[PDB]
Amino acid sequence: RRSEVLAEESIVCLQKALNHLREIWELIGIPEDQRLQRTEVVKKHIKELLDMMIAEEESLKERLIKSISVCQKELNTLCSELHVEPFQEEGETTILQLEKDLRTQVELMRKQKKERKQELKLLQEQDQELCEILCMPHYDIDSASVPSLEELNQFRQHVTTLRETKASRREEFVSIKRQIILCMEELDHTPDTSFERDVVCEDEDAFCLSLENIATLQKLLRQLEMQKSQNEAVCEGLRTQIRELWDRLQIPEEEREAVATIMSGSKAKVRKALQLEVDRLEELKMQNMKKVIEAIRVELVQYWDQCFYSQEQRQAFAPFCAEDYTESLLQLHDAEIVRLKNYYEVHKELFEGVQKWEETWRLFLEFERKASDPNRFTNRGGNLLKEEKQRAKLQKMLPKLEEELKARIELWEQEHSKAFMVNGQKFMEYVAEQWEMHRLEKERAKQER
Amino acid sequence: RRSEVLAEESIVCLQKALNHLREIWELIGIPEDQRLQRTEVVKKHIKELLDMMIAEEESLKERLIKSISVCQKELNTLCSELHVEPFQEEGETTILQLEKDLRTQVELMRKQKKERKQELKLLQEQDQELCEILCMPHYDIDSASVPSLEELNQFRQHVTTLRETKASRREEFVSIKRQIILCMEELDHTPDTSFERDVVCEDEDAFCLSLENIATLQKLLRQLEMQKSQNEAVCEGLRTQIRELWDRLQIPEEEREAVATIMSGSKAKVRKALQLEVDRLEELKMQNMKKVIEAIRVELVQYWDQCFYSQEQRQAFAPFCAEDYTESLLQLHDAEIVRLKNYYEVHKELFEGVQKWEETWRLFLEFERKASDPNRFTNRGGNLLKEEKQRAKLQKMLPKLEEELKARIELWEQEHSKAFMVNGQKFMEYVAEQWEMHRLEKE
């Protein structure tokens, strides 16, 4: 109302000024011509200014009103694209205020739109990122244009669940790697594969966490466990074989407790040591049986020096040589030597007398040689009579044997049959041949007397 | 009531405009703040403009008053100078019209001021120009400041009178110049003086028409006129002497006419010719008296033989033997020939007898000679008788003559006295002294 009064005040000012100008035009003489020529200037300036400001405001009405008319199309645009009810009031209803508020709400909803597009951009920046790793497809909108709150939250839950699954698969990767490492450390493997080097050495983050690479990881663990299982099986075999030779040989407590260290974790370089021990134990059995079989062969030689010996009867055997020691060899020697022992115990006295004859014979030859006077009396060993005295006893002992030996031999053929060889044939023929050489020596020495 | 109408018209326009603009401010919601601002803008600007208008009007009004004041004082001062005729118009004073009027009157007063001052300068210029030539004083001022109409009149009348005097001086100059010209023509002067040659040859406009050169001029004219008068007087004297010589001489009337042309003016030609004429006439007179004197001398010598003379008588008189032919000498010779002719004529009867005796005696000697020589008979002229007879007659006449003659010779010495001689002595003795020369010639 102050302005509405200041208007009337201005009018009053004008009227007063005009009155004054009319006064000073009277104090001095001034024609109506110059008076009108001076009032015309004032009216001109006035009209000019009035037209100026009134143009400013008249144009201003059109400006604000057009601004509103456009702004409403703009809001109807921005309330359709964005599912939100338009806002308004019913008091002012003031052109200025209405225009200002309309432009305000428009700017606001543009900020909203920009924020939605931006949020969408970030969501995409996470989506394309994660989908590359899990090898999952995205995402079917397909709107680089406009979104909605419902759709926004949908994609939000989508991404969050994606992060959940990604974290889970990451945990799986972690654990399985933690196991694979131990397996490779056990088998002493070292990767040597592009994939293996990725898993073990690239040390995250990797890889394409699609079901493919994961399945390959699982398969790798299965392979390491396969090799480990193989090791355990084989070395179980060896560990059991050493128990076999344990029981067969001796299995002492101390030795067993010693090898018990080797009776441990299969999957290593232990295998070589165990195979070494097996070859060593087999060789040990071979050499032990070698000692035993050698000994028994010596006993065979002794028992063949006890009776016998046709070298063809020595060759009547077979296990001589025997560079191979196939255990059963021992089982052969046992049989032959047992047979030989029993057979000896059967014809014991026979062979006893058989040696008795050669002993008595050689001795008797020595005594006859001493009695044949190589020097005698002058060069010999007294007593000289006792030598004859025993020579007689020997000479009595011989035919008692010869008759007793010719009996058992002739009895043996009836008992066993059918031939006889005693490093010569038969045996009493050798005897008679020795009696022959002796009696011939004596008959020839008799001519020397 | 028309400017007032347009004024109320503008008030209406303003009111309407304010109403409409306020209405626009009510339609569109203006929070009064901007209203109160804009109204302030309007009132401020308009009050500024109107105050500019008013201030301009006040400045111009006060200025007009100042102009009226200055022009008023100025007009007082412009009324004092020249003539005090202030002018006032009754009716409507009217500030503007009064200013325009006072300004105009000031303009006109300045105008006639400059006009009268310039006219003063010009009048002084003419004044000096003329006063340089007429050599008159000027003027009684010079008071170059301010003139009055009356003073203008005084200077004017002064100049007019000066022009009159100038014209007069020039007229007299012309007349006297002409006269002097004719004078110098008469005597063939050829000016010769710086003044003479300015006057004659320079032929205007000079010299200084002062009292100086005018007095000098008239003095020169007096000199030349005196010269001419002297000359004419001399010529008149010559003419008079010539006339006197005419009266003294025979002077033919047919010879007195052609000599009238020479007796004219007083030119040097006339002068010289007159002098020559006089000299010629004096010489002629002298030669005439000469001829006459010589003639009288020969008449004397005619009479110096008839009775006279003797060497003493030849020495007697004879003053003329130097030829000074005056009228006095003429008179002398006249007296002598008169006295001589009379001395002879008085004794003419007494003088003839001498020649008679001498002739008679001479021829007597002739006859006495021819009658003595005896060779006569053979070689002489007859008649001898006549000869002898005549001789006898002679001897008869001779002594009878001497008788009648000796009576007159003694009678003359009885008068004037006392003796006479002729070529010695002589005379009557010589008469007888010849008879003895005959008487001795006979022995």
State the DSSP string of A207-256.
--TTHHHHHHHHHHHHHHHHHHHHHHHHHHHHHHHHHHHHHHH---HHHH
Phi, psi of B84 (to 5 degrees): -80, 80
For the record, the structure tokens of A120 come out as 């969408």
CA distance linking residue A80 with residue A419, whole number of Å: 136
| A contact test, residue of B22, B26, B28 with most A CBs within 10 A | B28
CA distance linking residue A125 with residue A120, whole number of Å: 9
For the record, the structure tokens of B52 come out as 């500019």
- Residue B399 corresponds to which amino acid? P
CA-CA distances (angstroms) from residue A384 to A312, A363, A396? 46, 16, 19
- Widest pairwise Cα distance in chain B: 226
Q: Are A61 and B27 a contacting pair at CB < 8 A?
A: yes
Phi, psi of A135 (to 5 degrees): 55, 45
Q: What DSSP letter does each residue of A62-123 carry, written as one string?
A: HHHHHHHHHHHHHHHHHHHTTT------SS---HHHHHHHHHHHHHHHHHHHHHHHHHHHHH
CA distance linking residue B323 with residue B290, whole number of Å: 8
Q: Are B3 and A10 a contacting pair at CB < 8 A?
A: no
A31-53 exposure pattern, b = at least 16 Cβ within 10 A, e = fewer:
eeeebeebbeebbeebeebbeee
CA distance linking residue A320 with residue A296, whole number of Å: 11
User: Which chain A residues are Cβ-neighbours of B95 within 8 angstroms?
Assistant: 27-29
Whether the bond into B205 is cis, omega within 30 of 0: yes
Whether A303 and A337 have beta carbons less than 8 Å apart is answered as yes
Q: Are A11 and B18 a contacting pair at CB < 8 A?
A: yes
User: Which chain A residues are Cβ-neighbours of B18 within 8 angstroms?
Assistant: 7, 10-11
3-class secondary structure per residue, B371-422 = CCCHHHHCCCCCCHHHHHHHHHHHHHHHHHHHHHHHHHHHHHHCCCCCCCCC
For the record, the structure tokens of A149 come out as 């709150």
User: Tokens 């006072």 — which residue?
Assistant: B102
Closest-approach residue (CA) in chain A for B58: A24
Packed helices A95-134 and A149-187: angle between N→C axes, nearest 10 degrees: 20
CA distance linking residue A162 with residue A153, whole number of Å: 14
Q: Are B96 and A28 a contacting pair at CB < 8 A?
A: yes
Whether the bond into A309 is cis, omega within 30 of 0: yes
CA distance linking residue A181 with residue A200, whole number of Å: 7
Phi, psi of A448 (to 5 degrees): -80, 0
| A contact test, residue of B4, B13, B50 with most A CBs within 10 A | B50
Neighbours of B98 (CB within 10 A): 20
CA distance linking residue A219 with residue A225, whole number of Å: 10
Whether A420 and A426 have beta carbons less than 8 Å apart is answered as yes
Nearest to A21 among B36, B57, B94 (CB): B57
For the record, the structure tokens of A40 come out as 């015309």
| B contact test, residue of A1, A3, A64 with most B CBs within 10 A | A3
CA distance linking residue A207 with residue A216, whole number of Å: 11
- Percent helix, strand and coil across chain A, each rounded to 5? 75, 0, 25
* DSSP code of residue B314: H
Closest-approach residue (CA) in chain A for B57: A24
User: Which chain B residues are Cβ-neighbours of A24 within 8 angstroms?
Assistant: 54, 57-58, 61
CA distance linking residue A98 with residue A191, whole number of Å: 75
Is A376 in a helix, a strand, or coil? Answer: strand
CA-CA distances (angstroms) from residue B251 to A413, B130, B242, B256, B295? 283, 66, 10, 7, 22
CA distance B100 to chain A (A): 12
CA distance linking residue A339 with residue B155, whole number of Å: 218
CA distance A97 to chain B (A): 7
CA distance linking residue A179 with residue A175, whole number of Å: 6
Closest-approach residue (CA) in chain B for A95: B28
Whether A186 and A267 have beta carbons less than 8 Å apart is answered as yes
Whether A187 and A224 have beta carbons less than 8 Å apart is answered as yes
List Cβ<8 Å contacts ≥24 apart for A318-327.
A319/A293, A322/A293, A325/A286, A325/A289, A325/A290, A325/A293, A327/A285, A327/A289
Nearest one of A35, A51, A45 to A14, comparing CA atoms? A45
Closest-approach residue (CA) in chain A for B20: A54
CA distance linking residue B112 with residue B109, whole number of Å: 5
Phi, psi of B323 (to 5 degrees): 60, 70
Whether B74 and B66 have beta carbons less than 8 Å apart is answered as no
Nearest to A36 among B6, B30, B36 (CB): B6
Whether B133 and B208 have beta carbons less than 8 Å apart is answered as yes
> How far is C-alpha B198 from the geometric centre of its chain's CA atoms?
16
For the record, the structure tokens of B7 come out as 């004024």
Closest-approach residue (CA) in chain B for A30: B96
- Residue B44 corresponds to which amino acid? K
CA distance linking residue A191 with residue B198, whole number of Å: 158
Whether A56 and B52 have beta carbons less than 8 Å apart is answered as no
Is A379 in a helix, a strand, or coil? Answer: strand
List Cβ<8 Å contacts ≥24 apart for B291-299.
B292/B330, B292/B333, B293/B320, B293/B325, B293/B329, B293/B330, B293/B333, B296/B330, B296/B333, B296/B334, B296/B336, B296/B337, B297/B333, B299/B337, B299/B341
- Residue B59 corresponds to which amino acid? S
Closest-approach residue (CA) in chain B for A43: B10
First CA to last CA distance, chain B: 199
Nearest to A43 among B6, B30, B96 (CB): B6
User: Would you say the C-alpha torsion A256, A260, A263, A269 has a positive or negative sign?
Assistant: negative
A206 by Cβ neighbours in 10 Å (0-12 / 13-18 / 19+) ranks as middle
CA distance linking residue B135 with residue B215, whole number of Å: 13
Q: Are B50 and A14 a contacting pair at CB < 8 A?
A: yes
* DSSP code of residue A135: T
CA distance linking residue A430 with residue A436, whole number of Å: 9
Nearest to A43 among B4, B10, B92 (CB): B10
Packed helices B149-187 and B95-133: angle between N→C axes, nearest 10 degrees: 20
Packed helices B211-248 and B268-306: angle between N→C axes, nearest 10 degrees: 20
Q: Are A57 and B32 a contacting pair at CB < 8 A?
A: no
Residue B138, sorted as left (phi over 0), alpha (psi -120 to 50) or beta, turns out to be beta
Q: Are B39 and A15 a contacting pair at CB < 8 A?
A: no
A333 by Cβ neighbours in 10 Å (0-12 / 13-18 / 19+) ranks as buried
User: Which chain B residues are Cβ-neighbours of A60 within 8 angstroms?
Assistant: 24, 28
CA distance linking residue A223 with residue A180, whole number of Å: 10
CA distance linking residue B318 with residue B308, whole number of Å: 14
Q: Are B43 and A95 a contacting pair at CB < 8 A?
A: no
CA distance linking residue A369 with residue A62, whole number of Å: 177
CA distance A99 to chain B (A): 10
Chain A / chain B CB contacts < 8 angstroms: 128
CA distance B37 to chain A (A): 8
Q: Where are the domains of chain B?
A: 1-443
List Cβ<8 Å contacts ≥24 apart for B321-324.
B323/B290
* DSSP code of residue B260: G
For the record, the structure tokens of B282 come out as 């004096």
Q: Are A29 and B2 a contacting pair at CB < 8 A?
A: no
A101 by Cβ neighbours in 10 Å (0-12 / 13-18 / 19+) ranks as middle
List Cβ<8 Å contacts ≥24 apart for A74-79.
A74/A106, A75/A102, A75/A105, A75/A106, A75/A109, A78/A106, A78/A109, A78/A110, A78/A113, A79/A109
* DSSP code of residue A200: I
Rounded CA Rg of chain A: 69
CA-CA distances (angstroms) from residue A193 to A186, A219, B7, B315? 18, 14, 110, 221
**Run of H or E residues at A281:** helix A270-306
Nearest to B95 among A28, A36, A61 (CB): A28
Strand pairing partners for A379? A376
Q: Are A18 and B2 a contacting pair at CB < 8 A?
A: no
Rounded CA Rg of chain B: 69
Whether B381 and B410 have beta carbons less than 8 Å apart is answered as no
CA distance linking residue A388 with residue A398, whole number of Å: 15
Closest-approach residue (CA) in chain B for A10: B43
- Percent helix, strand and coil across chain B, each rounded to 5? 75, 0, 25
Nearest one of B140, B57, B54, B45 to B95, comparing CA atoms? B57
What is the experimental method?
A: X-ray
CA distance B75 to chain A (A): 22
First CA to last CA distance, chain A: 203
User: Tokens 């004429």 — which residue?
Assistant: B277
Whether A296 and A330 have beta carbons less than 8 Å apart is answered as yes
A22 by Cβ neighbours in 10 Å (0-12 / 13-18 / 19+) ranks as middle
Nearest to A3 among B14, B27, B39 (CB): B39
CA distance A52 to chain B (A): 11
Whether B279 and B287 have beta carbons less than 8 Å apart is answered as no
Packed helices B3-27 and B33-80: angle between N→C axes, nearest 10 degrees: 160
CA distance linking residue A82 with residue B402, whole number of Å: 232
Q: What DSSP letter does each residue of B183-218 carry, written as one string?
A: HHHHHT----SHHHHIIIII-SS-S--SHHHHHHHH
Could you tell me where the DSSP H helices lie in B249-347? 268-306, 311-315, 327-346
CA atoms within 13 A on the CB side of B353: 19
Q: Are B6 and A46 a contacting pair at CB < 8 A?
A: no
* Resolution given for this structure, in angstroms: 3.6
Q: Are A39 and B64 a contacting pair at CB < 8 A?
A: no
* DSSP code of residue A261: T
For the record, the structure tokens of B6 come out as 């347009």
Q: Are B53 and A35 a contacting pair at CB < 8 A?
A: no
| B contact test, residue of A9, A11, A14, A24 with most B CBs within 10 A | A14
